Automatic annotation (TrEMBL), chain B:
It comes from Escherichia coli. Enhances distal genes transcription elongation in a specialized subset of operons that encode extracytoplasmic components. RfaH is recruited into a multi-component RNA polymerase complex by the ops element, which is a short conserved DNA sequence located downstream of the main promoter of these operons. Once bound, RfaH suppresses pausing and inhibits Rho-dependent and intrinsic termination at a subset of sites. Termination signals are bypassed, which allows complete synthesis of long RNA chains. Interacts with both the nontemplate DNA and the RNA polymerase (RNAP). Belongs to the RfaH family. The chain holds residues 55 to 108 of 162 of the full protein. The gene is rfaH. This is Transcription antitermination protein RfaH. Coiled coil: none annotated.
Length: 251, 54, 288, 66, 1316
DNA sequence: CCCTGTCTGGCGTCCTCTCACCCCTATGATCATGA
DNA sequence: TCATGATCATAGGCGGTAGCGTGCGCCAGACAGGG
C-alpha cells in the first residue's frame, strides 16, 4: 500500500518473505564457498527460525517485530482468530446496496411499512431507476440516465415512486441478538434524513430512540423479494420463537 | 570469526559495547568449544575460485 | 451498611448518602459491561455447536420419550403441566384413570383444547416425544420437535431449529446476573418414595434412609408438595395417611447423624479395644 | 461440552470457523479428512444455498439427482 | 461590593453554607507539574536536573576521560503559538546544554587533567506548554493526561483462597521499585518461603540471605528466639519462660519448688504462667523425649576429633545428644517452633536449600538470571551488586523510600534510593509476622497506594531513557578516538533524545488528542486521572475491583463522572478541590475542628492521614460560632460512615461541592438524580456543541464563572483600567495609574481570535462584550468565547418545555420541537471543515495548479479565479471545484458529495525554490500589508499612550497650557523643567521611544523575512493549498438533543407553530417531552429544574412588564430588591441602594429575558423556596398550568407541567451518520466493498445477521447477500446488467475471498483442493 | 506406574464515528573557497 | 592548483561494551516430579 508520502509502509508478509530469501541466499553462498567444518550450522538455525517466524510467528520463543513492540503478522495470524479470513471476510461480509441512518418514531405508519428518506431511497435504488429510464425512453444510454439522476430532475421522483411501490427492504439493528432483529418493510418516502420506524415493532429490536442507528439493505433478486415478503415481513413475526408470547405488546 | 579469550573472570556484558558480537557457535545452549580445523590441519586455502561471488 | 439511606429523591440527599448510592450504581454499570462481554460469546458457542440440525424427516418412528411432570421445588407448583406439555407429540397414549379408556391417541399434537382437557381430568404425567430421544439419522424428525414456535401449526419440514434454539437460549443472557423440619401448606394424601422405615417405641414412624422423598398427593391425582427427607428423620405420620395444613410432620437433627436401629436388644462392643480403637475423653464440665 | 462437541466434528470447516484453527487444520491435514459441506456454515463459507429454507428443497433435488 | 461585570447581571444565589475556601485554579495539575519539570532548579531534584545529574558524568572504559555536566538553558522558540498552529511545526524550544570534557593523565586518576573544555551543545527539542495547559505537536493541540499507578515501596498482598483449592491462603510481599528489578517474596502450600526476581524462576528465599554474607548461625539468630538447655546433674534441665507455653499441652508433670504446677494431659493456663513468673521459676526438668525434635541453632564441633557433632538447623536425636554430652557442652541452644506462634518457615526453607556459602548462592542467582553459561565469582559479584545495590540500575524515589519506611513502621522517611540488608530482612520479618496472624494485609485500590504521575514526571522519564541511550553512545565514542582534538558536540548527537521525547509527545497511550468543542470539555479533559497506559492495567483484561469506587475516593476522585462502556472507573476524573501532594498522592482540604469550634483554617489531608482521624460531614448545622447544634453528628471514622458525638470530631469538610468534579457540579439539583442518570448527564454535558448565540443557564450552580474564567477561551484582563477602543477584531485597555509600571508607558491590546477551526470542527469564536469608555477591574472578562456569555458558561439554550404525551411523536425518548425554535435561529450551529490539496512530485514531471484545465467548461471555472484556487467568499455546493489540479489527467480537489458551505479562508504554502503563482503573491502582499499595518498600529497606539503619559507628567512643574501644542509632538522633552524626577522620566520615556523605533525597524524586517520565506515540507511536494469551508447546520428531525440530567432523545418532528399546546395567555410551548421517562429512569431533578426555571422566567416577565411600561427606577428598585432577598439564611444579601439609579436600569436590561438563579450542588434550593419564588411571580403554586390544544382547540384535562429547561444540542447530528451505497469502490486484497463513510462504503452484514437469516428460511436472500452483492466480481457485473435490463436474476459463482482462503492455506504446506 | 503439580496453549460482544501516526541519523561524496 | 571543510543526499532492523519485562483469568490437557 502507498501512504501518499513517497514511501511504502509494507505489509508484514513481504518483510517475512524478504527475511527468508536474505537468509537463504546467504546460506547458498556459504554452502558454495565451503563451510568452516563445524560451522555450516548457525546459518541453518537462522533459516529454520526465519521460516518458523513466517509460518506461525510467536509460537516459537520470542516473536519478531518491525515497529515497535507489536509482533508482526505471519500466515497463521491471517487465518486464525478475529481479524482473519474466517470471521472477518468469509462469514460476515461488507455488502453493496445498503445504507444506514438514525431512527425516529412517526406513528402514522401501518406496521408493515417504515419511513425512509428520499436521498437514501434514491441512492440505494439506482440501477432500478436506470432500468426504468431506458425502458420508458427518457435517456438513450446509461450515461445520460446517470447524469439525469445526479442532477435529480423533476421526473425521477415519479420513477422512484414507481420502483418503491411493492418492493421490501430489510431493516437491521446493529446488535442483532435474536432472529426478530432483521425484519422487512415496504418503504414510504420521507422528506428528511431519518428512518421513521413503527413504534410497536421497536419492542422486538430492543430499540429506544435516544440515538439508535439502523441499517437498511435491499433485496435485489426476485426470490429475495418473495422471501422478504412471505418469510420476514413485519406482520408475520408477531410471536416470538422463545415461547408463545406476542412480541407486538403495546409498550 | 575466530577470537581467543577467556570466559569467566572477564564477563561478557562489560565487553558487549563493541562489535565482534552476534553470539557464540552453539549447536546448543552453552557456548560450544569450537575446533580450529583451519588453524590446526587446514592452514592455507581458497583454491575454490576468486569467483568474486556473482 | 447498617445505617440506611433515610432520604428519598423528592427530598434531598446529603453527601454521604449520595456517595453510597454511587457505590451501588457503578457496581451495576460494570456488571452490565462484563455481562454483555460474556453473553455474546455464549450465543456464539451455542450457534456453533448447534449450527447444523435441520428438520429433515416427517416421522422417525419410535416411542421412547421423556416424562413431563410439573416441577416441584417444595412450595407452590412453579411451572404447571399446561405450560410444559403445550404442543408436543405424545409418546405413549394417555389413558385417563378409567383404565383401558384412551383419552388421546399416541401421535396427537397437544394444542390448547387438548391442554384444557388435560387440566380437567388432572392428568398425572403426559409422556411426550423429545428431540433428544429421536431416531433420524443426520437430523431431527418433525414429530419429535413439536409445534413450530412463533407459529401455530406443526413444524415445517426444513426450518433450521438449531439456530433459533441457540439464539433463544443466548438472547436473554444480557438480562441475567453475574456476580430443620418439614412445614406443609396444603392438604391431601401423604406419599413416601424410596424409604426404609421402622416403628420406634413411641409409636411413630422413624426412617432409616437418606433417599426418602415425601410427597403431598392432592385430591385429583397430582402432587403439590415435595420434600427431601434426611437420614434418620422422625415422622409424626406414615405413608398413605391424611394430614392438615400448618402441621409439621417431620423432625430431625441437621447437626447429628442418627445411627438408629431396627431390632430391640442389648448393646455390646465388638472389635473395640480401649486405648487404640476408642479413647478415654471425659466431658469435664458436664459429666456424661 | 459444547466447545469440545463443536471442535469434534467430521467436518473441518465448521471446526475451523469455530475456535483454534491451527489444531483443527493440522489434525485434518495429517488425517486427509474430506468435508462434504454438510449443513449450514460450510455452505455459508463456500457461497451457496443454505440447506434450511428454500435451499432445503434445492438440496433434496440435488441429492436426488446424485 | 461587586465587580463591574458583576453589576451587569448579578446571579440570584440560594445556598446556606457560608463558604470558606473558594474554588482553586482548575488547571493547576498540568501547569504546576510542567513548571516543576522545566525550571532552573538548584539542590538537585526535581526536574531536568535530576536526569542530568543522575546520568552524568559519563566516564569512559578506563581511558581516564570524563564528560561532566555544568548547566542547561532553553532559548526562545522560533515560532509563537499562532504561527505554529497555522504552519504545522512543533511548538518546541531548543535545549542548550553546557557540557565539559576533562581528560586525566597516566598513573594518577587522582591527578591533574591536562586540558578541559566547556562548551554549549544542542540536544533535542522539548515542546513547551501553552498557558491553557496544552501542547502543540503537529499543529494539533494535544493534552498529556495524568496516570494513576502503583506507589513504589513494599506491598504485602495476600493471594486469598483460590490457590491449591484447599483454602490455605498465600502471602506475597512485592517490593515495587521506581526503576529497576522487582522482588517478590511468597509462600507455597508446603509453607516454604520462595523469592523471585522479575517474575522469573523460583528459588528458596534464604539463598539471598547467604548472598548478603550471612552465615546460617546468624540467620537463625535473626529469625528465631533461643531456648536454653543446661545439663545440671539431672535430666538436662531447661530455662523456661512460660509465655511460650500459652495453650500448649505438656507431655509430663511440670513441677518446681517441690510443688506440682502443670499436670500431664492438660495445657498451661494463663494463671499458671502467672504462678511460674511470680515465683520466678527458671530451671525445670525435661524427659528424654522432649528434645526428640528440637532444632539446634548453631554448629557444635568436637574439640578432640575436630569434626562436626551436629550441623546447624538440625533436629536432635538420642545419639546426637550422646555425642555432644560427652564432648564438654553444657549449654544447648534450640529454637521455638510453635503451631500458632512461630512456624519454622525459615527452617524448612534452609532445609530445601542446597547452597552452603556466599559463592554458591551468588552462582545460583547468576544462573537463574542468565540461563546456561559459566559463572565466575567476579561476574556473580558484579551482577548481584548491580541488581539492588547500585545507584545506576536500581532507584527507589523519595516516594518509594517513604512508603518503604512507613509500611515497615520506621521513623526517618529519608534514606538512600538503593536497598540494603536491613531492608530485605525487614520485608521477610513483616511477611512472617503477617503469616503468624498479627498485622494486616494491604488492599490495592486504597488511594494511599495509588500515585499520580503527570506531564513533568513522564517527560522526565522519557528524557532519561533518551539519555541512557546517548550514554550508551558516548561511552562508545569517548575511549575510541584521538584526544585532545575533539569537542563535546562531535560526540553527543541529538537524534535519540529528540526521538524519545518526540515519540512520547507524538504517539503514546497518554498523549492524546484534545476533545475541544466546549470550554467544559477542555477543562475536564485536562483534569483526568487515567488508569491505563504504560505501567498500568489494560481494558480487555482487568477487571472487577479496579472498576469500583473505593471508600477513599471521597473528595479526591469524582464518583459520578466517568465514561460508561468498556472502561468505567479506569478513566476517573479528578475532583474540584483535590490538589496533588508533594510526593504524588492525592490530598484534599479540611477544616480543623478544635475541641468546640470549627476553626476556619484549611488543612490538607492525604489518603492515609484521613483514616486515622474522624471527619465531620460537609452539611452539618452549626450556630454562628462553630458549635455543632446537634449532639449526634454524622461522620466517618476509618472508611466507614457512622454517627458520632459532638466533640470527638477532628475535621469538617470545607464546602459541599467537593465530592464531585467540575463536569458534574454544573448540574443543578444533583442530589435529586439517581447516580446513573447523573453520570449520563455529566458525560453528555461534556459532549455539547456551541450554538450561534449562546444564552445563559437560568438554573445554574454558580460554578459557571470558575469554568469559564479558569479555562482559556475568554480574554481575561491583565491590568485593569478604562477601555479605549472596542472592535470585533481588537480591544484596547488603557491601564489605570494605580496599577501601572513607571517605564514602558503601557496600554494593552487584546487581539481576539476570530472564526477559526477547532479540533471537533466547531467554530471557536470570541466576541467582545464590553462597551466603550467602560471601567474594567483586574481579573475580569473582556471578550466572551465559545459558549460563554458575560463571563458565564452557556452551553445550550433554555426553552419552554411541557411534559405531556403528544400523539405518539415522543414515544420512547423522542423530543418534539416547535417551528418557533428553528425560526429564531437558536440552535443553528456553525461548523468549519478543512480541505487540503497537495501538489506532489511524480514522473513525467510535476503537477499543475493553474486553471487551464481539460474536460471542463465555463460552468465549473466560473467559481475559480485565473489561477485555480477558489475565491474567498464563493458559496459553493456539494461537488464543485475548489482547487484545480491536473497531473501529467484531472485530479482537481472537489467538495465532498453532500456538504455546502462558504469558503472563508485559503492558505497557500510553498516549498522554497518553486515559482510562486499570482495568487500566492496576492496572499503574500496581503499578509505583508496586514502585518505592516498591525506593527505600525502597535507603534502608533503605544506612542499615543506614551504621549498621554508625557501630558500627564507635565500637568505640574513648569506647565505650558498654550505652548504645549504649538510645536510638533515628538519634542516634548526640551521644555522648561529642571533636573527633577520629571526630566528623568522624560529621559526614560525617550529611551523607551528610541527602543520602540529601532525595535520596530528590526521586527518589521524579521516579519518580512517570515512572510517572504518558504516552509520546510513533505518529501516531494510543491505547494499545499488549504481551504476552509464554513457550513451552517441548523436543526432537523434526527439530531440529538438532551438536557443536563440524562434525558436524551432524537428530535422526531418539527411541528408548526399552531399545533403546539398553548395556555390561557396565548404563548405556545416550544418543546413537548415525554413524562414516562421520569419514574423508571429516576431523574427527578429535571422537574425541580423545570419549576425553578418557570419561577425565574416569571420574575423576568414581571421585570419586562414593569419596564415596558416606562416606569421610573423606584418601582424597579422595589421589585428587584424583593426578588433578591426571598429566602432563608442565605449567602447573597445584596442591596440595590448602592447602585445609583443607572446600573439598576442596566441590570434590569440584563434581567428582562429571565433572572439567573444559582443553585449549588448539595446545598440547593428546597421545595418551599421554589414555591415562595413562584408566589412572587403570579404563576400557579403547583407549577402546572392548564394547557389548551392546538389542533382541536379544546382543553387538556388534568393540568400539565410547563416551565423552562436548559437543553443542549449534542454533536451527534443526522447528516453525519446517514449514508447510502448502491455500487462504489471495492477493496484490493479481498474483492469486498470498503468500510466507512468518507470512503464510500457499505454496511457490514455481520455474523449475527447471517445467523438471523439462517434462523428464518431465507436462503436466496443470504446467497445474494454474500455472493452477488458482496464478493463475486463476474457475478455482480452480471447482476448489474440484469438489474438495468429488468431481469431480476443472479448467476451465483464463488466468493473471491474463499479463493483467498485457498491461497493462504495453500501457501503453507497444506494441500487444500476442490474435489469432483 | 500412579498420582499430582506445573506449564503453556487456547479463549475473552457487535456495529458505527472521529483523530493522529507511518524513520531520523550517520557517512560519504562533491563543490566551493582559501591559501 | 590543491587541500580542507561544509553541506546535501542517500542508505538499514533491542543499543550496547546491559537490561529492558512487573496491574488478567479460567480451563484443559500434556509433560513431568515425587513416591
Ligand atoms: Mg438507548
Ligand atoms: Zn424422532
Amino acid at each position: 500500500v502507498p501512504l501518499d508520502g513517497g514511501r511504502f509502509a509494507t505489509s508484514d508478509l513481504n518483510d517475512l518473505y524478504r527475511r527468508v530469501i536474505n537468509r537463504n541466499n546467504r546460506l547458498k553462498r556459504l554452502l558454495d564457498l565451503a563451510a568452516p567444518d563445524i560451522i555450516v550450522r548457525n546459518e541453518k538455525r537462522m533459516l529454520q527460525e526465519a521460516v518458523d517466524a513466517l509460518l506461525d510467528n510467536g509460537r516459537r520463543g520470542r516473536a519478531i517485530t518491525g515497529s515497535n513492540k507489536r509482533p508482526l503478522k505471519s500466515l497463521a495470524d491471517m487465518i486464525k482468530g478475529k481479524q482473519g479470513r474466517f470471521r472477518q471476510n468469509l462469514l460476515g461480509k461488507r455488502v453493496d446496496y445498503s445504507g444506514r441512518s438514525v431512527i425516529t418514531v412517526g406513528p402514522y405508519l401501518r406496521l408493515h411499512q417504515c419511513g425512509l428518506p428520499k436521498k437514501m431511497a434514491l441512492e440505494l435504488f439506482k440501477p432500478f431507476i436506470y432500468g426504468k429510464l431506458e425502458l420508458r425512453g427518457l435517456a438513450t444510454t446509461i450515461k445520460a440516465a446517470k447524469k439525469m439522476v445526479e442532477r435529480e430532475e423533476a421526473v425521477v421522483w415519479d420513477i422512484l415512486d414507481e420502483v418503491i411501490r411493492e418492493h421490501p427492504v430489510l431493516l437491521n439493528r446493529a446488535p442483532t441478538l435474536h432472529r426478530l432483529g432483521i425484519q422487512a418493510f415496504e418503504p414510504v418516502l420521507i422528506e428528511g434524513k431519518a428512518i421513521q420506524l413503527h413504534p410497536l415493532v421497536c419492542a422486538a429490536y430492543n430499540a429506544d430512540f435516544d440515538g439508535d442507528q439502523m441499517a437498511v439493505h435491499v433485496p435485489l433478486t426476485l426470490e429475495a423479494q418473495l422471501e422478504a415478503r412471505a418469510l420476514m415481513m413485519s406482520t408475520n413475526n408477531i410471536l416470538s420463537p422463545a415461547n408463545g408470547e406476542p412480541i407486538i405488546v403495546p409498550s | 570469526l575466530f577470537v581467543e579469550f577467556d570466559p569467566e573472570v572477564i564477563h561478557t556484558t562489560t565487553i558487549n559495547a563493541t562489535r565482534g558480537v552476534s553470539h557464540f557457535v552453539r549447536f546448543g545452549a552453552s557456548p560450544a568449544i569450537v575446533p580450529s580445523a583451519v588453524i590446526h590441519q587446514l592452514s592455507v586455502y581458497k583454491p575454490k575460485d576468486i569467483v568474486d561471488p556473482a | 451498611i447498617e445505617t440506611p439511606i433515610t432520604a428519598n429523591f423528592r427530598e434531598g440527599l446529603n453527601v454521604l448518602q449520595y456517595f453510597i448510592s454511587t457505590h451501588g450504581a457503578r457496581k451495576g454499570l460494570a456488571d452490565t459491561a462484563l455481562k454483555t462481554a460474556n453473553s455474546g460469546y455464549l450465543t456464539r458457542r451455542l450457534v456453533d455447536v448447534a449450527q447444523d440440525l435441520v428438520v429433515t424427516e416427517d416421522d422417525c418412528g419410535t416411542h421412547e420419550g421423556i416424562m413431563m411432570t410439573p416441577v416441584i421445588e417444595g412450595g407452590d407448583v412453579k411451572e404447571p403441566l399446561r405450560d410444559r406439555v403445550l404442543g408436543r407429540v405424545t409418546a405413549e397414549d394417555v389413558l385417563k384413570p378409567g383404565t383401558a379408556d384412551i383419552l388421546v391417541p399416541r401421535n396427537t399434537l397437544l394444542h390448547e383444547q387438548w391442554c384444557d382437557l388435560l387440566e380437567e381430568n388432572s392428568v398425572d404425567a403426559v409422556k411426550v416425544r423429545s428431540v433428544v430421544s429421536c431416531d433420524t439419522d443426520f437430523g431431527v424428525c418433525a414429530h419429535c420437535y413439536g409445534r413450530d414456535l412463533a407459529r401455530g401449526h406443526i413444524i415445517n419440514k426444513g426450518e433450521a431449529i438449531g439456530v433459533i434454539a441457540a439464539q433463544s437460549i443466548g438472547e436473554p443472557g444480557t438480562q441475567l446476573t453475574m456476580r430443620s423440619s418439614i412445614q406443609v401448606k396444603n392438604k391431601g394424601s401423604i406419599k413416601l418414595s424410596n424409604v426404609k422405615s421402622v416403628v420406634n417405641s413411641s409409636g411413630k414412624l422413624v426412617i432409616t434412609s437418606r433417599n426418602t422423598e415425601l410427597k403431598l398427593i392432592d385430591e385429583f391425582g397430582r402432587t403439590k408438595e415435595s420434600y427431601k427427607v434426611p437420614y434418620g428423620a422422625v415422622l409424626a405420620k406414615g405413608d398413605g395417611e391424611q394430614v392438615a395444613g400448618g402441621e409439621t410432620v417431620a423432625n430431625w437433627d441437621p447437626h447429628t447423624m442418627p445411627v438408629i436401629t431396627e431390632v430391640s436388644g442389648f448393646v455390646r462392643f465388638t472389635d473395640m479395644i480401649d486405648g487404640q480403637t476408642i479413647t478415654r475423653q471425659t466431658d469435664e464440665l458436664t459429666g456424661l | 461440552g459444547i466447545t469440545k462437541a463443536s471442535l469434534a466434528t467430521e467436518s473441518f470447516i465448521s471446526a475451523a470457523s469455530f475456535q483454534e484453527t491451527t489444531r483443527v487444520l493440522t489434525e485434518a491435514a495429517v488425517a486427509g479428512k474430506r468435508d462434504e459441506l454438510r449443513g449450514l456454515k460450510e455452505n455459508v463459507i463456500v457461497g451457496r444455498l443454505i440447506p434450511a429454507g428454500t435451499g432445503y428443497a434445492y438440496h433434496q433435488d440435488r441429492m436426488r439427482r446424485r | 461590593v461587586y465587580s463591574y461585570t458583576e453589576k451587569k447581571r448579578i446571579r440570584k444565589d440560594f445556598g446556606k453554607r457560608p463558604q470558606v475556601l473558594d474554588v482553586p485554579y482548575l488547571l493547576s495539575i498540568q501547569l504546576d507539574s510542567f513548571q516543576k519539570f522545566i525550571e532552573q532548579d538548584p539542590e538537585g531534584q526535581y526536574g531536568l536536573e535530576a536526569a542530568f545529574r543522575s546520568v552524568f558524568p559519563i566516564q569512559s572504559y578506563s581511558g581516564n576521560s570524563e564528560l561532566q555536566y555544568v548547566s542547561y538553558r532553553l532559548g526562545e522558540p522560533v515560532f509563537d503559538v499562532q504561527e505554529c498552529q497555522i504552519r504545522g511545526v512543533t511548538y518546541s524550544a531548543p535545549l542548550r546544554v553546557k557540557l565539559r570534557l576533562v581528560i586525566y593523565e597516566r598513573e594518577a586518576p587522582e591527578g591533574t587533567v591536562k586540558d578541559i573544555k566547556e562548551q554549549e551543545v544542542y540536544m533535542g527539542e522539548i515542546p513547551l506548554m501553552t498557558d491553557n495547559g496544552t501542547f502543540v505537536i503537529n499543529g494539533t493541540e494535544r493534552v498529556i493526561v495524568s496516570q494513576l499507578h502503583r506507589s513504589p515501596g513494599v506491598f504485602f498482598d495476600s493471594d486469598k483462597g483460590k490457590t491449591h483449592s484447599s483454602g490455605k491462603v498465600l502471602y506475597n510481599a512485592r517490593i515495587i521499585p521506581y526503576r529497576g528489578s522487582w522482588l517478590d517474596f511468597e509462600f507455597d502450600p508446603k509453607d516454604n518461603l520462595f523469592v523471585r526476581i522479575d517474575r522469573r524462576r523460583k528459588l528458596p528465599a534464604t539463598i539471598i540471605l547467604r548472598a548478603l554474607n550471612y552465615t546460617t548461625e546468624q540467620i537463625l539468630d535473626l529469625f528465631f528466639e533461643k531456648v536454653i538447655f543446661e545439663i545440671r546433674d539431672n535430666k538436662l534441665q531447661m530455662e523456661l519462660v512460660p509465655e511460650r507455653l500459652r495453650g500448649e499441652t505438656a507431655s509430663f508433670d511440670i513441677e518446681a519448688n517441690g510443688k506440682v504446677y502443670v499436670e500431664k494431659g492438660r495445657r498451661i493456663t494463663a494463671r499458671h504462667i502467672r504462678q511460674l513468673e511470680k515465683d520466678d521459676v527458671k530451671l525445670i526438668e525435661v524427659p528424654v523425649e522432649y528434645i526428640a525434635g528440637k532444632v539446634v541453632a548453631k554448629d557444635y564441633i568436637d574439640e578432640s576429633t575436630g569434626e562436626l557433632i551436629c550441623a546447624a538447623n538440625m533436629e536432635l536425636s538420642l545419639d546426637l545428644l550422646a555425642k555432644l554430652s560427652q564432648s564438654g557442652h553444657k549449654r544447648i541452644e534450640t529454637l521455638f517452633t510453635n503451631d500458632l506462634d512461630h512456624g519454622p518457615y525459615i527452617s524448612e526453607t534452609l532445609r530445601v536449600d542446597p547452597t552452603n556459602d556466599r559463592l554458591s548462592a551468588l552462582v545460583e542467582i547468576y544462573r537463574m538470571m542468565r540461563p546456561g553459561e559459566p559463572p565466575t565469582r567476579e561476574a556473580a559479584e558484579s551482577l548481584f551488586e548491580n541488581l539492588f545495590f547500585s545507584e545506576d540500575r536500581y532507584d527507589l524515589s523519595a516516594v518509594g523510600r517513604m512508603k518503604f519506611n512507613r509500611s515497615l513502621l520506621r521513623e526517618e522517611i529519608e534514606g538512600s534510593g538503593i536497598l540494603s540488608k536491613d531492608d530485605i530482612i525487614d520485608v521477610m520479618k513483616k511477611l512472617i509476622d503477617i503469616r503468624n496472624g498479627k498485622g494486616e494485609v494491604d488492599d490495592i485500590d486504597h488511594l494511599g497506594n495509588r500515585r499520580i504521575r503527570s506531564v513533568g514526571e513522564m517527560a522526565e522519564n522519557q528524557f532519561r531513557v533518551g539519555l541512557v541511550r546517548v550514554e550508551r553512545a558516548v561511552k562508545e565514542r569517548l575511549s575510541l578516538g584521538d584526544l585532545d582534538t575533539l569537542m563535546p558536540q562531535d560526540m553527543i548527537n541529538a537524534k535519540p533524545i529528540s526521538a524519545a521525547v518526540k515519540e512520547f509527545f507524538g504517539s503514546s497511550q497518554l498523549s492524546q488528542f484534545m476533545d475541544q468543542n466546549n470550554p467544559l470539555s477542555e477543562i475536564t479533559h485536562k483534569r483526568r486521572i487515567s488508569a491505563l497506559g504504560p505501567g498500568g492495567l489494560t481494558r480487555e483484561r482487568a477487571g472487577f475491583e479496579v472498576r469500583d469506587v473505593h471508600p477513599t475516593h471521597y473528595g479526591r476522585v469524582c464518583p459520578i463522572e466517568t465514561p460508561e462502556g468498556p472502561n468505567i472507573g479506569l478513566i476517573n476524573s479528578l475532583s474540584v478541590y483535590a490538589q496533588t501532594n508533594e510526593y504524588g498522592f492525592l490530598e484534599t482540604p479540611y477544616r480543623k475542628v478544635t475541641d468546640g469550634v470549627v476553626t476556619d483554617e484549611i488543612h490538607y489531608l492525604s489518603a492515609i492521614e484521613e483514616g486515622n482521624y474522624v471527619i465531620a460531614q460537609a452539611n452539618s448545622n452549626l450556630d454562628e460560632e462553630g458549635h455543632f447544634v446537634e449532639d449526634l453528628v454524622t461522620c466517618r471514622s476509618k472508611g466507614e460512615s457512622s454517627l458520632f458525638s459532638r466533640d470527638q470530631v477532628d475535621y469538617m469538610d470545607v464546602s459541599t461541592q467537593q465530592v464531585v468534579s467540575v463536569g458534574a457540579s454544573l448540574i443543578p439539583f444533583l442530589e435529586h438524580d439517581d447516580a446513573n442518570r447523573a453520570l449520563m448527564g455529566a458525560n453528555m454535558q461534556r459532549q455539547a456543541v456551541p450554538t450561534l448565540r449562546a444564552d445563559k443557564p437560568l438554573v445554574g450552580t454558580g460554578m459557571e464563572r470558575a469554568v469559564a474564567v479558569d479555562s482559556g477561551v475568554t480574554a481575561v484582563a491583565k491590568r485593569g483600567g478604562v477601555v479605549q477602543y472596542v472592535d470585533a477584531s481588537r480591544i484596547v485597555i488603557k491601564v489605570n495609574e494605580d496599577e501601572m509600571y513607571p517605564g514602558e508607558a503601557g496600554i494593552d491590546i487584546y487581539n481576539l481570535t476570530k472564526y477559526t477551526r477547532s479540533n471537533q470542527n466547531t467554530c471557536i469564536n470570541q466576541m467582545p462584550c464590553v462597551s466603550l469608555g467602560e471601567p474594567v477591574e483586574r481579573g475580569d472578562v473582556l471578550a466572551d468565547g465559545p459558549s460563554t456569555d458575560l463571563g458565564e458558561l452557556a452551553l445550550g439554550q433554555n426553552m419552554r418545555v411541557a411534559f405531556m404525551p403528544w400523539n405518539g411523536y415522543n414515544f420512547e425518548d423522542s423530543i418534539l420541537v416547535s417551528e418557533r425554535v428553528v425560526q429564531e435561529d437558536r440552535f443553528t450551529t456553525i461548523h468549519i471543515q478543512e480541505l487540503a490539496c497537495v501538489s506532489r512530485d511524480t514522473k513525467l514531471g510535476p503537477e499543475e495548479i493553474t486553471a487551464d484545465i481539460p474536460n471542463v467548461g465555463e460552468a465549473a471555472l466560473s467559481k475559480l479565479d485565473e489561477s485555480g484556487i477558489v475565491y474567498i467568499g464563493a458559496e459553493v455546493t456539494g461537488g464543485d471545484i475548489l482547487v484545480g489540479k491536473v497531473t501529467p489527467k484531472d485530479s482537481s480537489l472537489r467538495v465532498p458529495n453532500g456538504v455546502s458551505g462558504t469558503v472563508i479562508d485559503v492558505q497557500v504554502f510553498t516549498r522554497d525554490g518553486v515559482e510562486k503563482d499570482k495568487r500566492a503573491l496576492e496572499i503574500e502582499e496581503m499578509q505583508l500589508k496586514q502585518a505592516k499595518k498591525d506593527l505600525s498600529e502597535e507603534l502608533q497606539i503605544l506612542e499615543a499612550g506614551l504621549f498621554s503619559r508625557i501630558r500627564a507628567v507635565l500637568v505640574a512643574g513648569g506647565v505650558e497650557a498654550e505652548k504645549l501644542d504649538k510645536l510638533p509632538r515628538d519634542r516634548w522633552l526640551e521644555l522648561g523643567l529642571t533636573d527633577e524626577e520629571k526630566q528623568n522620566q522624560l529621559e526614560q520615556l525617550a529611551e523607551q521611544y528610541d527602543e520602540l523605533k529601532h525595535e520596530f525597524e528590526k521586527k518589521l524586517e524579521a516579519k518580512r523575512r517570515k512572510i517572504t520565506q518558504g516552509d520546510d515540507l513533505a518529501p516531494g511536494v510543491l505547494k499545499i493549498v488549504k481551504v476552509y469551508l464554513a457550513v451552517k447546520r441548523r436543526i432537523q428531525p434526527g439530531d440529538k438533543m438532551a438536557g443536563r440530567h440524562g434525558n436524551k432523545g432524537v428530535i422526531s418532528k418539527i411541528n408548526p407553530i399552531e399545533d403546539m399546546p398553548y395556555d390561557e395567555n396565548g404563548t405556545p410551548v416550544d418543546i413537548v417531552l415525554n413524562p414516562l421517562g421520569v419514574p423508571s429512569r429516576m431523574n427527578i431533578g429535571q422537574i425541580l429544574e423545570t419549576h425553578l426555571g418557570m419561577a425565574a422566567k416569571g420574575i423576568g416577565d414581571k421585570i419586562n412588564a414593569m419596564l415596558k411600561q416606562q416606569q421610573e427606577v423606584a418601582k424597579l428598585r422595589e421589585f428587584i430588591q424583593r426578588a433578591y432577598d426571598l429566602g432563608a439564611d442565605v449567602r447573597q444579601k445584596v442591596d440595590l441602594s448602592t447602585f445609583s439609579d443607572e446600573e439598576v436600569m442596566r441590570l434590569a436590561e440584563n434581567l428582562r429575558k429571565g433572572m439567573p438563579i444559582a443553585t449549588p450542588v448539595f446545598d440547593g434550593a428546597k421545595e418551599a423556596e421554589i414555591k415562595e419564588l413562584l408566589k412572587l411571580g403570579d404563576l400557579p403554586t403547583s407549577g402546572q398550568i392548564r394547557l389548551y390544544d392546538g389542533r382541536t382547540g379544546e382543553q387538556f384535562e388534568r393540568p400539565v407541567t410547563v416551565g423552562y429547561m436548559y437543553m443542549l444540542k449534542l454533536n451527534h447530528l443526522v447528516d453525519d451518520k446517514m449514508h447510502a451505497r448502491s455500487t462504489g469502490s471495492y477493496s484490493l486484497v479481498t474483492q469486498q466493498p470498503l468500510g466507512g463513510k468518507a470512503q464510500f462504503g457499505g454496511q457490514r452484514f455481520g455474523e449475527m445477521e447471517v445467523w438471523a437469516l439462517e434462523a428464518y428460511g431465507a436462503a436466496y436472500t443470504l446467497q445474494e447477500m454474500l455472493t452477488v452483492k458482496s464478493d463475486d466480481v463476474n457475478g455482480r457485473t452480471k447482476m448489474y446488467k440484469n438489474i438495468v435490463d429488468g431481469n431480476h436474476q443472479m448467476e451465483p459463482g464463488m466468493p473471491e475471498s474463499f479463493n483467498v482462503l485457498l491461497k493462504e492455506i495453500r501457501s503453507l504446506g497444506i494441500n487444500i483442493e476442490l474435489e469432483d
